[PDB]
């Protein structure tokens, strides 16, 4: 329920890299694509251009994949799976899968409380019965 202490999580870039000329056209979706033009201001990386994706922006290995709570995430879609995930696991937390129905989530939460594995989405889909 409480994560091990760990080290400060530093994110090198706060805002997502966006593809060149994403703002100008709806057809160009924000998904990053490498600058490929012969005379692309982006490929050259001229002053005032959007930043380019580089391995340098990599998060510290120990903090990589870790969620803000301090635990990491391993998804669970059933109760058997949750007992396997928590077995010998004080470094991870379980997000109930979106597919899991409201009826089944009650079983997962009740087992999780016994297991001691934190559930990130414990309040999801809670509306009494049918």
């Amino acid at each position: 329920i409480h994560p091990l202490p760990h080290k400060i999580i530093i994110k090198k870039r706060k805002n997502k890299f966006i593809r060149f000329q994403s703002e100008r056209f709806v057809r160009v979706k924000p998904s990053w694509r490498k600058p490929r033009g012969i005379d692309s201001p982006m490929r050259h990386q001229y002053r005032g251009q959007r930043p380019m994706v580089s391995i340098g922006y990599g998060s510290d290995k120990e903090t990589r994949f870790m969620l803000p709570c301090g635990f990491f995430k391993h998804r669970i879609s059933t109760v058997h799976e949750l007992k396997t995930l928590f077995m010998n696991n004080k470094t991870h937390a379980a997000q109930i899968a979106h597919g899991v129905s409201a009826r089944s989530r009650k079983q997962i939460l009740e087992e999780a409380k016994k297991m001691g594995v934190r559930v990130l989405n414990a309040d999801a889909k809670l509306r009494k019965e049918e």
Binding site: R33, K34, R36, I38
Partner: protein, 148 residues
Amino acid sequence: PTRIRKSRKRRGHRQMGYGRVGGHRKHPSGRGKAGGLQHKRTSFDKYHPGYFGKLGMRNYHVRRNIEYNPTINIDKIWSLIPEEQRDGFLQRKSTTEAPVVDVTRFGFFKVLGRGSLPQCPIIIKARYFSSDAEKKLREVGGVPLLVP
């Protein structure tokens, strides 16, 4: 396996591995082995010696069966003999019981000599025998008999 292929990785690059200054266009070097005496003489001379010209007499029909002549070396004659029989033969020697191997029956017509026969005497039967082969078997005390 299409997934694990160079072309799929090169998607997203435009020219797809074929260049900008020169692009993939249809047959820009001609089709087939063409221009081997003109534009491609450099390659044909460098890697293809004897490609152009006529060099020999012509047989309008070739009768493969008569031009077929299988040969066996003097080293493998003992190998043809089965092992159980062969191991005793070498210790026993004996002019009277010397092994007869009809290389023709095994499937070879001419005996050439590439190696050395074992000293125990052997009688070889074949359609033809090379002179070095005749000499070596004669040294091992064997006989080069002919077969019909």
